[PDB]
From a paper:
Within their active site, molybdenum or tungsten are chelated by a metal-binding pterin (MPT, also known as molybdopterin) forming the so-called molybdenum (Moco) or tungsten cofactors (Wco), respectively. Wco and Moco biosyntheses represent multistep pathways that start from GTP and involve three isolatable intermediates: cyclic pyranopterin monophosphate (cPMP), MPT and adenylylated MPT (MPT-AMP). MPT-adenylyl-transferases (EC 2.7.7.75) convert MPT to MPT-AMP, prior to the final metal insertion step, which requires either tungstate or molybdate to produce Wco and Moco, respectively. In this study we investigated the influence of hexamerization on the structural stability and enzymatic activity of [name] MPT-adenylyl-transferase [name] (PfuMoaB).
We determined the crystal structure of PfuMoaB at 2.5 Å resolution and engineered a hexamerization-deficient variant of PfuMoaB using structure-guided mutagenesis. PfuMoaB was crystallized in the space group P3121 with three molecules (chains A, B and C) in the asymmetric unit. Each PfuMoaB subunit consists of a slightly bent central β-sheet, surrounded by six α-helices and two 310 helices. In the crystal structure a hexamer can be generated by rotation of the asymmetric unit by 180° around the two-fold crystallographic symmetry axis. Therefore, similar to the other proteins of the [name] family, PfuMoaB represents a dimer of trimers. In the crystal structure of PfuMoaB residual electron density was observed in close proximity to the Gly-Gly-Thr-Gly motif. PfuMoaB crystals were grown in a solution containing 2-(N-morpholino)ethanesulfonic acid (MES), which with its negatively charged sulfonate part resembles sulfate or phosphate. Therefore, only a sulfate molecule was manually positioned into the respective electron density patch leading to an improved overall model quality. Assembly of subunits into trimers is additionally strengthened through several ionic interactions, including salt bridges between Arg109 of one monomer and Glu106 of another monomer, and a cluster of ionic interactions involving Lys100 of one subunit and Arg124 and Glu92 of the adjacent polypeptide chain. Thus, hydrophobic residues of α3-helix were identified as key residues for the association of two trimers within the hexamer.
Residue numbers in the entry:
A (entry chain A), C (entry chain A): 11 to 169
B (entry chain B), E (entry chain B): 12 to 169
D (entry chain C), F (entry chain C): 10 to 169
Amino acid sequence: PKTFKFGVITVSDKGAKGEREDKSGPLIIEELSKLGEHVYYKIVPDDKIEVLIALFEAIKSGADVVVTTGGTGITRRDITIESIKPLFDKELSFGEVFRAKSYEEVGYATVLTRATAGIIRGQERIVVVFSLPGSVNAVKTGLEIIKSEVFHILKHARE
Amino acid sequence: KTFKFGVITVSDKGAKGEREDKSGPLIIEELSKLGEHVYYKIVPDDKIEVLIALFEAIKSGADVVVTTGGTGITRRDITIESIKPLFDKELSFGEVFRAKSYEEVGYATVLTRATAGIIRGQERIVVVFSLPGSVNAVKTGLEIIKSEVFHILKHARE
Amino acid sequence: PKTFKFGVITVSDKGAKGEREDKSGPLIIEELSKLGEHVYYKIVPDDKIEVLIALFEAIKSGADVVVTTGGTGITRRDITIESIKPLFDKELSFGEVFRAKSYEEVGYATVLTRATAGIIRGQERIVVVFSLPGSVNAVKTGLEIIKSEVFHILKHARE
Amino acid sequence: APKTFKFGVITVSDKGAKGEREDKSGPLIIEELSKLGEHVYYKIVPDDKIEVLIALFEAIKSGADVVVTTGGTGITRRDITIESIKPLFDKELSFGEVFRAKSYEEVGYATVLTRATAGIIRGQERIVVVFSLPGSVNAVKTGLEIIKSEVFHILKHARE
Amino acid sequence: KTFKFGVITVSDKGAKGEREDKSGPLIIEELSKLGEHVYYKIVPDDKIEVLIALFEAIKSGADVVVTTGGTGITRRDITIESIKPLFDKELSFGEVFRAKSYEEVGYATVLTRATAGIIRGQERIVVVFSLPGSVNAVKTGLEIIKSEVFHILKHARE
Amino acid sequence: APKTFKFGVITVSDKGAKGEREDKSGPLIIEELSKLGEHVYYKIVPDDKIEVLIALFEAIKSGADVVVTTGGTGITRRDITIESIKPLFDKELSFGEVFRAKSYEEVGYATVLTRATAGIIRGQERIVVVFSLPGSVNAVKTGLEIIKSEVFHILKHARE
C-alpha cells in the first residue's frame, strides 16, 4: 500500500457563497499531500445533491480516499452523514476513535461531535470516505488519525 | 410543462461493447416526446459506476433519470441496492409496475424488481426510476413513466 | 371481537389554521361510528410533533384503532408516514390492498398513492393505526377496506 | 442451469409441535414439491425464533436449495417466522405481492392480513431460496401454485 | 438561557406503587437548577405507556425530556427500542456516557445502554435523553446532561 | 440465577477451514472458557455466510447458551461474520465499544479497523449470547478478558 489519490470536499452554505474563507479544506490538502496525491477539491453548500455530485466527481477523478469537512452536526441544514452513510458497504469505527481523542480537547462536548468513515465498493474498486466536522480544529484532530491509519485501511479494504 | 432527463443502462456486456443497447435508445426516444434529453451513458453492473453516472446526469440538469438493468437477483445486480438508499421519498412504482406486468408474464413477476423515488437538495428535486433490462420491461415502465412523470414532478416540487 | 373505540386525526396546515373545512375527518367519524365508538378527533398541522401528540392522546383516550388522513404524499411538508411507521411492531398489507382498489379509480396515479397500516403493541394492549391520504375520495375508498377488515384485524392483533 | 433441486419443509405451530393439531399443510407441501425436487428434510417446530432458525439451517445443511416454512406469518405476538428469517435474505423477492394478488380473488380485502415472503440467502457460491407461507391449507395451496410455477426460474437467476 | 423539561421513570414496580422512585426526583432536583420543570410521571415498562408520557411531557412544553429505566437487555426493557426510532438526529450520548461509566464499573458497561436524540417538528425541537434506572447511572448522566444541555439546544434550534 | 452455562466456539477462516493455517484462536477460547462453562461445540468454517450460520445453529442445538466466533470481522469482501449474525440479535450489547476501549491501549488508532460485536438471540423463553471477535490471537485475548468478566452478568440480565 505505497501511495493513494485523495479528494476533499468542504460543505458550507457560507463557504460556497464566498462569505467565509475555507481553511479546513486546504488543511486536509496540505496534510494528506504528505502521504498521497491530491486530485480533487470542491466547496459545496449544505445540500444533499451538491454533496453527492462532489463525492462522485472526486471518485471519478481517481480518489481512493475522500474526506469531507462540514455538515456533520445536528442542525436542520446538516445533511452530510445522512447523505453519505447509506452508501457504505463497510462501516469503520472512525467516529468512535475520533471522539475518544476529541474528549481530551472538548470533553463532554463530544456528545455533539459527529464524524464517520466507510468503504464504498465497486466490483473491484474501493473508496474510503471520512466525514469530519467543519471546524479547523476538529479537522486538525481528525487528520492525525487519518494520517496514521489511511494506509492500514486501504490495505485491508482491498481484500 | 417540461423537464430535462437522463438515461443510464447498466450492463457488463453492454459496457464492454459486446452487446447492443436497445433499451436505452427506446427510453430516449420516448421521453424526448415529453421533455428534454440531457444525458446518456452505459455502465457496468458496478455500484461506483452506476452512482458516478447518476450524479453526472443530475449535474447535467436531469430532473428525471431512468436507469435500466441491474435490478435482478443475481450477485452482479446492484442497481436498486445502490440507489434506493438515497431516496428521501419512495414512490409505489415497483408495485404498479408489477401489477401491469402480472398481465403479460403472470407469476414470473416474483422476479421483477423496479423502483422509483425522489432525491432532494435544499430546493431541487430529482425523480429516479429504475427498471429491468429487457426491452419488454422497459416498454411497460415507459407507459407508467410517461403517464405520471409530470404529476410526480408537480407534487415533489411543491 | 364485538366493538372497539376509535380516534381520528386530520393532518393539514390549512385545516389546522381554519382556512379549509375538514370533510375527511368527519367522514371517518360517521363511517366508523356504525362499527364502533368514536372517542377522539383532532386537526393538526403537517408537523411531526403535533401528529404524534395527537396519536398518543387518541390512544390515551382509549382508541383501539386510529385513522389519520393527510400528509401521506411526497412533498416536503408530508411527514405522516415517516413519523408513524417506525413505531409499528407489525406492519399490515393495507397500502397494497388500498392501491389495488384505487387503481380502478385513478389507475397509474396510484404510483403516488401512499397509505399504510400497522400495529403498535404494549405489554397487553394493541392499537391499529391506518394512515390515509388527505382527499375525501381517497378516504372514502380507504374506509370500505377499513370497515370490512377492522374486526378481522383486531381479533388477530389481540393474540 | 439447474436439473433438479433439493428441498426442506418446516411447519411452525405451537399446537402442532406439541401433538395437538394434526399437521395437514407440511405434508401437502411435501407431496406437491416432491413432484419437482428431492425432499430432504421435514420438522414441526413451535412458534419460536430459535427453533425455527435451528430447523432452517438443518434443512440447509442436509443440502436443501429451497425451503418452505408454513405458519407463524400473522400479526399475533406468537408469530415470529418472517421476523426471524427475512433479515437473513441477501435479495428479497416480490413473492408476497404476487401471493397477495392471487389470494385476493378468493379472499378480497382479507389480504390486508396476508403475509408471506421469499428471498435468497447466499454463501460464497451456494444459494438457498426460502419461501414463507401462512398456516392454512388454502393459503398453502395458493403459495404452491406459485412455487411450482417459479422455483426453477428463481433458482436459475439466483445462481446467475 | 432556559428550557422547560420533563422526567419519566419507567418501571413496572415503580408504577404499581410497590417500590419508591429515587431516580426521578433526583433528575427533577438537578435540572430545576438549570431550567423549568413542567412534567413528571411514572409508567410501566410498556411502549404505549412510555410514548403517551413522552408526548404528554412534550405537549406540556418540555424542550428536554429525560427518561430513566427500561434501557436494559431483559424482555421487559423497551425504552430505547420505543424512542430511538423517533429521532431525526441521534447524539453520541450513549458513547460518552459509557466512557464515563467505564471508570466506575469497567467491563460491566457492556450492559450499559443510554441514548439521546432530537425530535423535530416544522420549527420546534425536543431533546430526549434515555438513561438507565440506577441512581448511580442517573448521577453520571446528569453530569453530562447539565454540562451540555444548553449547547445541544443551541445547535438543534439553529 | 445461572449456575453454569454451555458454550460453542466457531473460528471462521478460509485458510483454516482448508487445512493450511493452524487454528490457534479457537483452542485458546476453548481453554479459557472451559474454566467457566461446559464446552459443547467446535468447528472451523470458511468465511462463508451459510457455513457460519449452519455452525451457529448447530452450537445452539447442542445446548450452547454462549457462542463465540473468531474471524471474519474485518473490512475485506471475504468478511461476512458480523453481517451474517448481527441481524439476528433481539438486543445488541455495547461489547464493541468496550473491546475497542481496552484494545486502544495496546494498538491506539488501529482500533478504527477493530470490529467486534455481541448480542442476544431469544426464543419464547430461551436466550443465546453471541460474541464475535477478530481473528488474531491478541484480539482474542482482549475479548476473552471481557467475556470472562461479564458472561454471567450478561446471562443473568438476558434471561431476566
